[PDB]
PDB file of C-alpha atoms in Angstrom:
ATOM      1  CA  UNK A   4      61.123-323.571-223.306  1.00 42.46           C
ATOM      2  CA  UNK A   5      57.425-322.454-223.536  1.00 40.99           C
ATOM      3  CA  UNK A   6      56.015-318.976-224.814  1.00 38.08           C
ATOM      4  CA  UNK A   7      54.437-317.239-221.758  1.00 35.22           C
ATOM      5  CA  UNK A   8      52.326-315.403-224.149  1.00 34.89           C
ATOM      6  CA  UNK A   9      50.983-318.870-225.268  1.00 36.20           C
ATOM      7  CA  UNK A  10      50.335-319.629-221.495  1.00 40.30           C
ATOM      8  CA  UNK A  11      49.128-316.234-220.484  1.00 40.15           C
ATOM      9  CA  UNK A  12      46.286-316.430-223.726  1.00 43.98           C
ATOM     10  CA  UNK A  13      45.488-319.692-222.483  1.00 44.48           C
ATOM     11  CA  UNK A  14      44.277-318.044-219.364  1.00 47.75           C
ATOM     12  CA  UNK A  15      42.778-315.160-221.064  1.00 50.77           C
ATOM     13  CA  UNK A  16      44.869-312.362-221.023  1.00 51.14           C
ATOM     14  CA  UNK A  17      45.406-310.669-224.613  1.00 50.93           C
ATOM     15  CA  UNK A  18      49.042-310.854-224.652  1.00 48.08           C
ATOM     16  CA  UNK A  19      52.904-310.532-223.077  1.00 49.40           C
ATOM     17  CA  UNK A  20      54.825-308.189-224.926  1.00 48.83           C
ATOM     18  CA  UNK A  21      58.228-306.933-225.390  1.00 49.38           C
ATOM     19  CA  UNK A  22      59.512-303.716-226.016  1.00 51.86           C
ATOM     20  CA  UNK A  23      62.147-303.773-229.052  1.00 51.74           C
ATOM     21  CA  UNK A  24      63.199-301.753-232.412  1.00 49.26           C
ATOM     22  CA  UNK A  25      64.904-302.046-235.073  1.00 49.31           C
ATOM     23  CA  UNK A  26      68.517-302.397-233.870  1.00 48.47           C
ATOM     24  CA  UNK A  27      67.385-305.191-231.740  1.00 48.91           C
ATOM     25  CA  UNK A  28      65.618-307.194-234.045  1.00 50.62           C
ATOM     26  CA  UNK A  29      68.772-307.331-236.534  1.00 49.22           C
ATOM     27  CA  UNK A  30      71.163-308.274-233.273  1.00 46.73           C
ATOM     28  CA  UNK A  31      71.424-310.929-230.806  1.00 44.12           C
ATOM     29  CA  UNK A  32      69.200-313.307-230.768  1.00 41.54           C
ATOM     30  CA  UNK A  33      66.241-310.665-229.778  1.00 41.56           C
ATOM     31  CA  UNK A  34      64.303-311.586-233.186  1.00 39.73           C
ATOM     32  CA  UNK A  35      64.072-315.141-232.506  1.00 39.04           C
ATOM     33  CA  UNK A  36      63.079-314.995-229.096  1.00 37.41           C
ATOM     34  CA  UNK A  37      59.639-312.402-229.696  1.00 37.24           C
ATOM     35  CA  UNK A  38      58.864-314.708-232.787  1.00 37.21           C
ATOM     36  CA  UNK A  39      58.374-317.677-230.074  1.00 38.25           C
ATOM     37  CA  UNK A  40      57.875-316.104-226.814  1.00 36.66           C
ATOM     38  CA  UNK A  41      55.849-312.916-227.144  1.00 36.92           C
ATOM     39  CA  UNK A  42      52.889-311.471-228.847  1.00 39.38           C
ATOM     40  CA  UNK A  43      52.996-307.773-228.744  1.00 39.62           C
ATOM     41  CA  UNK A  44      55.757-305.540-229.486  1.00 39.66           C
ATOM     42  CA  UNK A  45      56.205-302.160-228.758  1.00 38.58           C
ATOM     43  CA  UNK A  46      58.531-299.372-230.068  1.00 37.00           C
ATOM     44  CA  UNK A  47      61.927-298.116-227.870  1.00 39.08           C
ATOM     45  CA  UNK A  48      62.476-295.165-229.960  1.00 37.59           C
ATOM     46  CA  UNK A  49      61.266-294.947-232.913  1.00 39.13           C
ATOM     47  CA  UNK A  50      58.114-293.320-232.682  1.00 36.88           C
ATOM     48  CA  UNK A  51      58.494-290.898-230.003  1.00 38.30           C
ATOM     49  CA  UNK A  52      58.559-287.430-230.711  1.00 38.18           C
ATOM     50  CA  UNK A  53      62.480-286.513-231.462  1.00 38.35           C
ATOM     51  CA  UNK A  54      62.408-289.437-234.054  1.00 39.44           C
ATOM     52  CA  UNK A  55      59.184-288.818-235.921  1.00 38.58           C
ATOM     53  CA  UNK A  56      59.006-284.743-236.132  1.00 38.32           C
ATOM     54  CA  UNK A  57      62.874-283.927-235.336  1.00 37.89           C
ATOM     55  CA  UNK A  58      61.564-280.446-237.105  1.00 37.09           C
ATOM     56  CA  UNK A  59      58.271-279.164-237.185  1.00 34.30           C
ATOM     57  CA  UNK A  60      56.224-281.197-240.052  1.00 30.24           C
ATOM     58  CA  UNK A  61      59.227-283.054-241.160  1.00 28.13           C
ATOM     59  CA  UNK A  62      57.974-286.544-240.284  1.00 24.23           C
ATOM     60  CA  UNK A  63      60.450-289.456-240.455  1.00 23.29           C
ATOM     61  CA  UNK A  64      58.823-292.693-240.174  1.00 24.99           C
ATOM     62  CA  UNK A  65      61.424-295.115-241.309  1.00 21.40           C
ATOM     63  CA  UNK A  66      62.350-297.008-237.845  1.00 18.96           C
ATOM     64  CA  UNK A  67      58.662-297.249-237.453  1.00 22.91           C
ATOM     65  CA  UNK A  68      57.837-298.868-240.528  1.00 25.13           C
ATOM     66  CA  UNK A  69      60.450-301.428-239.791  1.00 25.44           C
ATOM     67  CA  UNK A  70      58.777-302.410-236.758  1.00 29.16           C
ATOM     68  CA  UNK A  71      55.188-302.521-238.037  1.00 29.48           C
ATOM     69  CA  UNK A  72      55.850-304.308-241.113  1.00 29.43           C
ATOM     70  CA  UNK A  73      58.136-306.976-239.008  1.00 30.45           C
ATOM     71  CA  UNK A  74      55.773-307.293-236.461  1.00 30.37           C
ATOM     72  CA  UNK A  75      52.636-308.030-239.282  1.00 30.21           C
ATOM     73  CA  UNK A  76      54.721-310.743-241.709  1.00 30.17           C
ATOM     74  CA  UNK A  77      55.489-312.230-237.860  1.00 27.72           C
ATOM     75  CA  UNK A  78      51.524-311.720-236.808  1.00 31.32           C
ATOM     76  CA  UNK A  79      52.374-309.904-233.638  1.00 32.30           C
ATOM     77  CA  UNK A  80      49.914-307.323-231.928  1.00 31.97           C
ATOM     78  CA  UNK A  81      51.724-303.783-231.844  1.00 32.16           C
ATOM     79  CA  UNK A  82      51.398-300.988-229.662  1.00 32.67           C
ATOM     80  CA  UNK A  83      52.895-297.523-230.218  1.00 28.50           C
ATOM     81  CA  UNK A  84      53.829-294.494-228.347  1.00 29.89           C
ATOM     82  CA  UNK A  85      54.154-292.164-227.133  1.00 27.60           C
ATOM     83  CA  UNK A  86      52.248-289.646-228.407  1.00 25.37           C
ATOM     84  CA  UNK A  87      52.984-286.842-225.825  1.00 24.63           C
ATOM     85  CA  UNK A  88      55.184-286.476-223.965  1.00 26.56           C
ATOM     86  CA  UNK A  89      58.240-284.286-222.388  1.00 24.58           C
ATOM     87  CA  UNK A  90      60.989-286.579-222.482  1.00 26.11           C
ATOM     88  CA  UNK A  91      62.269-286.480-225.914  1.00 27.99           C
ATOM     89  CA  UNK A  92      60.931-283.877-226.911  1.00 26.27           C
ATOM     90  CA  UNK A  93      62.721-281.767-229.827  1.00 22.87           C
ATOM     91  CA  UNK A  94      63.954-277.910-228.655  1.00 23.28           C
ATOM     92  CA  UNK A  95      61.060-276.777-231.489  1.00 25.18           C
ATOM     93  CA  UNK A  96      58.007-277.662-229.543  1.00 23.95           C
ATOM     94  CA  UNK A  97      59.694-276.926-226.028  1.00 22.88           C
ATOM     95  CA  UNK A  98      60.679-273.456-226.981  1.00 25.22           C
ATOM     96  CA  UNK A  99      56.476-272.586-228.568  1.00 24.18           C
ATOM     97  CA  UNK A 100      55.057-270.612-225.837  1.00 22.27           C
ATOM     98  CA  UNK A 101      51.555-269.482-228.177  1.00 22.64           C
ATOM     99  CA  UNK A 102      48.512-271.985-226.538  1.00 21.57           C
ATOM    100  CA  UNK A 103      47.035-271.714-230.095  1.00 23.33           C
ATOM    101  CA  UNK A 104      50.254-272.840-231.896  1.00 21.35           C
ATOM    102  CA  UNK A 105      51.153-275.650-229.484  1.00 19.96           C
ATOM    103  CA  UNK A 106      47.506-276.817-229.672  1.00 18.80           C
ATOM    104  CA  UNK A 107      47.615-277.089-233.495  1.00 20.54           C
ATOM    105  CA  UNK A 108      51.203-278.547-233.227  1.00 23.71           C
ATOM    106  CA  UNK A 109      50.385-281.561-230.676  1.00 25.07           C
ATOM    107  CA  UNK A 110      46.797-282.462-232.603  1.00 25.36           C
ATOM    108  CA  UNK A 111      49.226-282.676-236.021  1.00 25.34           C
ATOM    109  CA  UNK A 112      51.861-284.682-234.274  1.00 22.71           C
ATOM    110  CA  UNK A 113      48.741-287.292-232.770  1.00 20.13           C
ATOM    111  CA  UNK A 114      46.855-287.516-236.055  1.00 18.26           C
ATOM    112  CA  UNK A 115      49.800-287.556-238.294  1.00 15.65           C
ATOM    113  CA  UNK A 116      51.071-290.812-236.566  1.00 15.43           C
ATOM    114  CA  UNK A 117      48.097-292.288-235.692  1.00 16.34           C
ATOM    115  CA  UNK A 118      46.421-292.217-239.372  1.00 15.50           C
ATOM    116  CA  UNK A 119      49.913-293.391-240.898  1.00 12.72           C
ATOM    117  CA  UNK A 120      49.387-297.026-239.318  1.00 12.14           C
ATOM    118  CA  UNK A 121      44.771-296.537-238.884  1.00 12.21           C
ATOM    119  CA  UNK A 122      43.915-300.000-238.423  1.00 14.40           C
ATOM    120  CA  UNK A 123      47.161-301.482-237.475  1.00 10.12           C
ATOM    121  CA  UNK A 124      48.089-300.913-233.592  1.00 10.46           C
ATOM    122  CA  UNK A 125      46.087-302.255-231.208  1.00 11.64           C
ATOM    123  CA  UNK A 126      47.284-299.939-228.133  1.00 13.72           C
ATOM    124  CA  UNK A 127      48.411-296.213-228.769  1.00 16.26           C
ATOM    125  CA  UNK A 128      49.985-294.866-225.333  1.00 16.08           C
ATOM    126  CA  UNK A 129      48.788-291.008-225.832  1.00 14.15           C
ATOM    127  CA  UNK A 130      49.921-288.948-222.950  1.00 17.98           C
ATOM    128  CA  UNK A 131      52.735-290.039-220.607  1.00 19.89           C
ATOM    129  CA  UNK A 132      54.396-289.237-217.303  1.00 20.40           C
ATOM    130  CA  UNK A 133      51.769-286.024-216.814  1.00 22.30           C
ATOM    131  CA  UNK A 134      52.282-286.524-213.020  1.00 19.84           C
ATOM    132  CA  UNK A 135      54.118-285.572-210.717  1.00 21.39           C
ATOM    133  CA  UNK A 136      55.070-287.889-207.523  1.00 20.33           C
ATOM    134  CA  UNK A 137      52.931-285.895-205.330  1.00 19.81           C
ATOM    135  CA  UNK A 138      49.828-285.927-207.433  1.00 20.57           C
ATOM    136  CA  UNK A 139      49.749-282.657-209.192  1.00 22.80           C
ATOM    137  CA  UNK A 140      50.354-282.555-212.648  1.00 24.43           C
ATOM    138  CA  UNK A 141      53.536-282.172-214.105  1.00 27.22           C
ATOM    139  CA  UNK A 142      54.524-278.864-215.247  1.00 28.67           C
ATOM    140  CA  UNK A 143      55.227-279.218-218.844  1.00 28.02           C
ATOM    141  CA  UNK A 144      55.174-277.395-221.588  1.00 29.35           C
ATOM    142  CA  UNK A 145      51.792-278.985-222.186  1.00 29.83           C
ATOM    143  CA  UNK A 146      50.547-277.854-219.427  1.00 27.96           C
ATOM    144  CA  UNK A 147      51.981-274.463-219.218  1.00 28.82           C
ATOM    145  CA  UNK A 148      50.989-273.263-222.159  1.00 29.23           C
ATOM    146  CA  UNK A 149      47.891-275.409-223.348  1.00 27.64           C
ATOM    147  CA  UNK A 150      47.089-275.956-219.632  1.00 27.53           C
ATOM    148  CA  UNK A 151      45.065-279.086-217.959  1.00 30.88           C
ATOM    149  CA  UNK A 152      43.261-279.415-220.931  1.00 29.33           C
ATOM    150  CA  UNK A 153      46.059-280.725-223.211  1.00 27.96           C
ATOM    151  CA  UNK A 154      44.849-284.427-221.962  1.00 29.34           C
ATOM    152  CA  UNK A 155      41.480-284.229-222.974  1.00 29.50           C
ATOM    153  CA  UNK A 156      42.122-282.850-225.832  1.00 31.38           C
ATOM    154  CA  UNK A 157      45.142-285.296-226.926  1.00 30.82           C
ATOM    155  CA  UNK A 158      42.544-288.078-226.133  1.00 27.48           C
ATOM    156  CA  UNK A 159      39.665-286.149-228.439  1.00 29.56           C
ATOM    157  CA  UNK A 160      42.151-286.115-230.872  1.00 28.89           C
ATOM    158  CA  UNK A 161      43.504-289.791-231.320  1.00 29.87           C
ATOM    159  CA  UNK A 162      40.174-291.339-230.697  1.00 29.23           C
ATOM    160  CA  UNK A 163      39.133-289.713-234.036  1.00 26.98           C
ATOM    161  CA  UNK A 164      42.388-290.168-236.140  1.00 28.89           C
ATOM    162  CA  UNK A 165      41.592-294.308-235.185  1.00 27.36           C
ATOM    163  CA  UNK A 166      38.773-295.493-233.126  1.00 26.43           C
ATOM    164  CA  UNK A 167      39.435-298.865-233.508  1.00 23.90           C
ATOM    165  CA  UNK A 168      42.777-298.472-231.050  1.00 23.86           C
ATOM    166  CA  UNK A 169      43.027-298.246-227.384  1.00 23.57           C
ATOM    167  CA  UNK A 170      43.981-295.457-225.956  1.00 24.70           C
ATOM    168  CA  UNK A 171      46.358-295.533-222.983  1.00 23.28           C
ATOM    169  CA  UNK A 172      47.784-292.960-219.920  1.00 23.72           C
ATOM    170  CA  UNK A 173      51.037-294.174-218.779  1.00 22.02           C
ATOM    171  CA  UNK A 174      52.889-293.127-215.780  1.00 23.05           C
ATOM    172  CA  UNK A 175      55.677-294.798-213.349  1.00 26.02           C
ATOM    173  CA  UNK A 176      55.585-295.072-210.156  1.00 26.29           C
ATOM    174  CA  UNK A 177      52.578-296.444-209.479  1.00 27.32           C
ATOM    175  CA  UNK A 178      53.130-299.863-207.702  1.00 32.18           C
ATOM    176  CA  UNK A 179      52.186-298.823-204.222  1.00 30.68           C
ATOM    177  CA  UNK A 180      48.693-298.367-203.645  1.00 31.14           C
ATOM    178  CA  UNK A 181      49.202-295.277-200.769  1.00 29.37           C
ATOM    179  CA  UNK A 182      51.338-293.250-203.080  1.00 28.66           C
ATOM    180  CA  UNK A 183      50.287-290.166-203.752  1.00 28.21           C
ATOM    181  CA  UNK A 184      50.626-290.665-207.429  1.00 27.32           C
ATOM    182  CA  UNK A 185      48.669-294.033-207.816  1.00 28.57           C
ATOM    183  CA  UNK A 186      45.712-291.895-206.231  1.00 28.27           C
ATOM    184  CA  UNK A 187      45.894-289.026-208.303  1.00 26.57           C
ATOM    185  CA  UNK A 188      46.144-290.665-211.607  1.00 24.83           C
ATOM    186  CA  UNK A 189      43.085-292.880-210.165  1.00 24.08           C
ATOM    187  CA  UNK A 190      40.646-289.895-208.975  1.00 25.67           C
ATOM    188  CA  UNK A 191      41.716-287.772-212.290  1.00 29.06           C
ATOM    189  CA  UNK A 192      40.857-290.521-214.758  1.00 31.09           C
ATOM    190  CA  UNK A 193      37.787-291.241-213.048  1.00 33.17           C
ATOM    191  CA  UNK A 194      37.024-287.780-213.449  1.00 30.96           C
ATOM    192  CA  UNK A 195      38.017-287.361-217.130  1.00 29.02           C
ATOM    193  CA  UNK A 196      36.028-290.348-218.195  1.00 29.27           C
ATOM    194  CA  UNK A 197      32.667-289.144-216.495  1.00 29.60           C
ATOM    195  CA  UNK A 198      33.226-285.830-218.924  1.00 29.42           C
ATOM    196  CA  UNK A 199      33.448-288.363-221.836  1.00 32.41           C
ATOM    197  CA  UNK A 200      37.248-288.136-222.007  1.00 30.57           C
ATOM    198  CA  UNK A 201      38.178-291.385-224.421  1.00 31.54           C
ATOM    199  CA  UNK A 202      40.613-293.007-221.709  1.00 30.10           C
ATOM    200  CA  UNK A 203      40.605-296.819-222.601  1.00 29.70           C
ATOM    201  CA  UNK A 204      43.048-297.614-220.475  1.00 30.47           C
ATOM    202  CA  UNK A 205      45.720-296.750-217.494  1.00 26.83           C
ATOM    203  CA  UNK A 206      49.218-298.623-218.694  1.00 24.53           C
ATOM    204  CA  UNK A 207      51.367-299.081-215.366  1.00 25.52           C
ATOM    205  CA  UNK A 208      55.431-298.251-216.018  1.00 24.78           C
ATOM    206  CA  UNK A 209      56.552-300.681-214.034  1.00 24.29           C
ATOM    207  CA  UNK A 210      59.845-300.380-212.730  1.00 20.49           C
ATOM    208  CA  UNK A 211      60.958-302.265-209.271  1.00 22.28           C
ATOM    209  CA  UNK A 212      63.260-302.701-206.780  1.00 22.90           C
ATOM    210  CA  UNK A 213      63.987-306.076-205.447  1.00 20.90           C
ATOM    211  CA  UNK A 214      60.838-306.800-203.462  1.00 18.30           C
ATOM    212  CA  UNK A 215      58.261-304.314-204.852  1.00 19.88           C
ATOM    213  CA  UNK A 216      56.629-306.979-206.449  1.00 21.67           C
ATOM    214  CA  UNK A 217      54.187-307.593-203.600  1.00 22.93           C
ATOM    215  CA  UNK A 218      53.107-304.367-203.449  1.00 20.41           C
ATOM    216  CA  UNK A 219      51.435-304.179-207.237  1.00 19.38           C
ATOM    217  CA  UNK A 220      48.983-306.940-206.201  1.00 20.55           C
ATOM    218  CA  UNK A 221      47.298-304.115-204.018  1.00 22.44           C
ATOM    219  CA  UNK A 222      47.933-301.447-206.183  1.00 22.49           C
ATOM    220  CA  UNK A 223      46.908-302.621-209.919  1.00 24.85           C
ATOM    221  CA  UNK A 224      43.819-303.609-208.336  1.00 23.87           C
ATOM    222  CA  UNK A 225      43.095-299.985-207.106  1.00 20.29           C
ATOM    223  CA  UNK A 226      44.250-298.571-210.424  1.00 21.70           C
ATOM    224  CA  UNK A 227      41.788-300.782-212.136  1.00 21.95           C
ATOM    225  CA  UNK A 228      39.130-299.209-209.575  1.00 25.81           C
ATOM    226  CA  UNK A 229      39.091-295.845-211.813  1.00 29.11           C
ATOM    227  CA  UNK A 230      36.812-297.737-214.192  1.00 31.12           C
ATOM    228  CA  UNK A 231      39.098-297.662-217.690  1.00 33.34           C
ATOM    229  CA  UNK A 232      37.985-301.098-219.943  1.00 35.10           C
ATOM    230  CA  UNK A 233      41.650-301.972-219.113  1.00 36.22           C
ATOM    231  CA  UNK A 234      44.367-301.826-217.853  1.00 33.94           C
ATOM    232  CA  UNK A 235      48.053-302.852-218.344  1.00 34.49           C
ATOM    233  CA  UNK A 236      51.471-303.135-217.131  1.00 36.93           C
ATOM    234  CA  UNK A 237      54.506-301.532-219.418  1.00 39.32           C
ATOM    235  CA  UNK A 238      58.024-301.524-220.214  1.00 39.13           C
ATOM    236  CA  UNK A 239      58.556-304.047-216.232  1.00 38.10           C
ATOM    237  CA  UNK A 240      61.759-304.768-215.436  1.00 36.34           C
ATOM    238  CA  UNK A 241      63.087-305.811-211.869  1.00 38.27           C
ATOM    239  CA  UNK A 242      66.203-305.282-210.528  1.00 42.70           C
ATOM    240  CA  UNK A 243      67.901-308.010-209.630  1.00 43.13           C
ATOM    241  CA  UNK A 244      65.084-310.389-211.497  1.00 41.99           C
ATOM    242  CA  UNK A 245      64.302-312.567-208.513  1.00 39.65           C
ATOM    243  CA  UNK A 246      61.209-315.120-209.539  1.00 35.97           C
ATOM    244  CA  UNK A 247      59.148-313.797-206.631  1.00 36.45           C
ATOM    245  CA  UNK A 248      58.773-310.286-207.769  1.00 35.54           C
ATOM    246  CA  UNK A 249      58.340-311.375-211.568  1.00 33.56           C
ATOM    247  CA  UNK A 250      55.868-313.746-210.474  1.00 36.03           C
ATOM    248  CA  UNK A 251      53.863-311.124-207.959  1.00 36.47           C
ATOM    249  CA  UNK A 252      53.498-308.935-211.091  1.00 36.70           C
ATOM    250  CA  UNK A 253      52.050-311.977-213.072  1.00 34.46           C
ATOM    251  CA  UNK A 254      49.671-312.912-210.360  1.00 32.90           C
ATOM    252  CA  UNK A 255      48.608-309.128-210.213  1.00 31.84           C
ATOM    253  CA  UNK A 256      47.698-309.015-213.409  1.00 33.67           C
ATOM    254  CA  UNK A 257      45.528-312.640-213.751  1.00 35.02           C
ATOM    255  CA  UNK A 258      44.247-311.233-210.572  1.00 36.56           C
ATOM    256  CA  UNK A 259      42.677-308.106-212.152  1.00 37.90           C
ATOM    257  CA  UNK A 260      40.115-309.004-214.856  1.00 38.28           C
ATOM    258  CA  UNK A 261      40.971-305.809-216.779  1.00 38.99           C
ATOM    259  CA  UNK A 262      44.506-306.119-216.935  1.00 35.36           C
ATOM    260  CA  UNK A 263      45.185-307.252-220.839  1.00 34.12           C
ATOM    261  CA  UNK A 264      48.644-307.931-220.347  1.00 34.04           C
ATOM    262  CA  UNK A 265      52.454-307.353-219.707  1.00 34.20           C
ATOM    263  CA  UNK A 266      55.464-305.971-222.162  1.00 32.87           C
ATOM    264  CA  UNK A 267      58.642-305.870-220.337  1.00 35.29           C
ATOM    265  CA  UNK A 268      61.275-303.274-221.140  1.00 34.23           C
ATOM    266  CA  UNK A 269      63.488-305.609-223.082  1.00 33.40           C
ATOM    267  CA  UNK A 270      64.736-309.538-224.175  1.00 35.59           C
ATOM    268  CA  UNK A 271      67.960-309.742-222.805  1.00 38.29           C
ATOM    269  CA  UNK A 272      69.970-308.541-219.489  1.00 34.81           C
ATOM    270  CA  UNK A 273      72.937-306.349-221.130  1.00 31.69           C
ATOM    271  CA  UNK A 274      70.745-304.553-223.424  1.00 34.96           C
ATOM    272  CA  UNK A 275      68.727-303.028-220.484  1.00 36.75           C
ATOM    273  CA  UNK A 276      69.558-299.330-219.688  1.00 36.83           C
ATOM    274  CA  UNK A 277      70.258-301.032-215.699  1.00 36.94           C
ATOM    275  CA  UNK A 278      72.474-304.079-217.052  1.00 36.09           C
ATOM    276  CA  UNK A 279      74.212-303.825-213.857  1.00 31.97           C
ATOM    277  CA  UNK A 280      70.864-304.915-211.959  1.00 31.02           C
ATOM    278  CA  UNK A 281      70.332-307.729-214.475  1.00 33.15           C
ATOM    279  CA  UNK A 282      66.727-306.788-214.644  1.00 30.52           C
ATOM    280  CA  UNK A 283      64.846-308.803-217.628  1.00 29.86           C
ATOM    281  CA  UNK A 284      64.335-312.185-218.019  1.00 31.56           C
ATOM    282  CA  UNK A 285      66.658-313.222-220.742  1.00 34.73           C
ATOM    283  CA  UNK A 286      70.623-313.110-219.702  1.00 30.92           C
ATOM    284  CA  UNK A 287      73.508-312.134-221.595  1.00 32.79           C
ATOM    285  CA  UNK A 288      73.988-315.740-223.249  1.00 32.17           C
ATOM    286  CA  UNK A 289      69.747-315.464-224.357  1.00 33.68           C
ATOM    287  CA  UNK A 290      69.413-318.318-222.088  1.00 36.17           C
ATOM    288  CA  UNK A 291      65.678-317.948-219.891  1.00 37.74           C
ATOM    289  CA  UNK A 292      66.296-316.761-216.519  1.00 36.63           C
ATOM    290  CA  UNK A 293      64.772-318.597-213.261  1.00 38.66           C
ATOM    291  CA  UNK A 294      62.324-315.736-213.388  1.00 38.59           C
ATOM    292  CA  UNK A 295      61.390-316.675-216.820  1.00 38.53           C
ATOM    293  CA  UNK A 296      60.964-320.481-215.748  1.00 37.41           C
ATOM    294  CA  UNK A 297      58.634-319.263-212.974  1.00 36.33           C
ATOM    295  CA  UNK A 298      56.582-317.078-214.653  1.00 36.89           C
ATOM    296  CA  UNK A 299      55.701-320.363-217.324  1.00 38.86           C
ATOM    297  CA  UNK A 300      55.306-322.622-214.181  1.00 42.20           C
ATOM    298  CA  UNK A 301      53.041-319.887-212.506  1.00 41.72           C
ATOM    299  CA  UNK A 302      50.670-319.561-215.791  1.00 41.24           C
ATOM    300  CA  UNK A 303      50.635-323.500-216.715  1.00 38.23           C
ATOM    301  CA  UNK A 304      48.796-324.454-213.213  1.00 36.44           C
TER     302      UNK A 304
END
């Protein structure tokens, strides 16, 4: 079959990604299928926080070094994250209640990573999930100790460990354009880039339910409206994988000159941590999915 990032660069988008590692790569027939059918990958695990600095200045890089040297002998683009963040997080930096000590500990952990691989990743996500699904920031232990300005600062930080990458705010739940969360993240990151906050770009987490689809072509073109260069969706998956959800996203995104692109949260259907809603676009035999089929159709007209 045909390589929708092929098709999606022919109508000027940057790329369509996958999210892999590792494990994946060495398995299945996950390797095989990126080489021909996408051209950005991203890292599951391996270079979040509890599997880079699992103690304090201990850095382990090794899953990540896999990834980056695969993805440049196979010429892929590669995006990394996430910088910070409180989902796997390791007890050390949860338990750090000193704003001075936590500051110094989250600009180490940014510039640490992001000078290991200067030059190399196109996308760095920096600061994820800092919302909560009413609009107000999420209360973690960022935020409670550093307080609101942990995200400028993580963003001062990174731009000057490697200018030359993008720099990305992720959240989920963003694919309606009257939820309270899609107009917070909005108003704040207009707000931080008028200060001169380095926000290159809002990265959408896109997770649906069957028939959410149509609701992201009103709401990435909002998000877009807060004025970042770009803007991108993440780690999609759909449950239940019909074609017209996939293909809603698509048309979203072609839609919205900013939008660079879409990674989806996988390759194939039993690897996904909702197998049960065969959400990706690859099934368990690696075989494309009618949503996979669409999505070329869709981007060769």
């Amino acid at each position: 079959a045909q390589s929708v990032d092929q098709l999606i660069k022919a109508r000027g988008k940057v790329y369509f990604g996958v999210c892999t590692d590792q494990n994946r790569l060495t398995t299945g027939k996950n390797a095989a299928i990126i080489q021909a059918d996408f051209g950005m990958v991203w890292p599951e695990n391996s270079m979040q926080w509890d599997a880079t600095e699992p103690s304090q200045g201990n850095f382990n890089f090794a899953g990540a070094d896999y990834l980056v040297n695969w993805a440049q002998q196979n010429g892929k683009l590669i995006g990394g994250g996430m910088l910070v963040w409180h989902s796997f997080l390791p007890s050390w930096v949860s338990s750090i209640t000193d704003k001075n000590t936590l500051t110094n500990v989250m600009k180490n952990h940014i510039t640490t990573l992001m000078t290991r691989y200067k030059g190399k990743i196109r996308t760095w996500d920096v600061v994820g999930e800092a919302f909560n699904e009413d609009g107000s920031l999420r209360q973690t232990v960022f935020l409670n100790v550093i307080g609101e300005d942990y995200i400028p600062i993580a963003f001062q930080t990174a731009r000057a460990a490697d200018p030359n990458a993008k720099l990305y705010i992720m959240d989920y739940n963003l694919d309606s354009a009257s939820y309270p969360k899609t107009q917070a993240i909005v108003n704040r990151v207009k707000q931080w880039r008028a200060a001169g906050v380095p926000i290159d770009g809002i990265g959408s987490q896109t997770h649906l339910s069957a028939g959410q689809g149509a609701g992201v072509l009103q709401a990435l073109p909002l998000l877009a409206s807060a004025g970042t260069p770009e803007v991108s969706i993440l780690m999609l998956d759909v449950a239940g994988a019909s074609p017209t959800d996939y293909v809603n996203v698509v048309n979203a995104c072609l839609n919205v000159q900013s939008c660079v692109g879409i990674t989806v949260f996988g390759v194939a259907d039993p690897d996904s941590v909702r197998a049960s809603t065969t959400p990706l676009l690859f099934d368990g035999n690696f075989n494309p999915k009618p949503a996979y089929n669409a999505i070329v159709q869709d981007l060769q007209q």
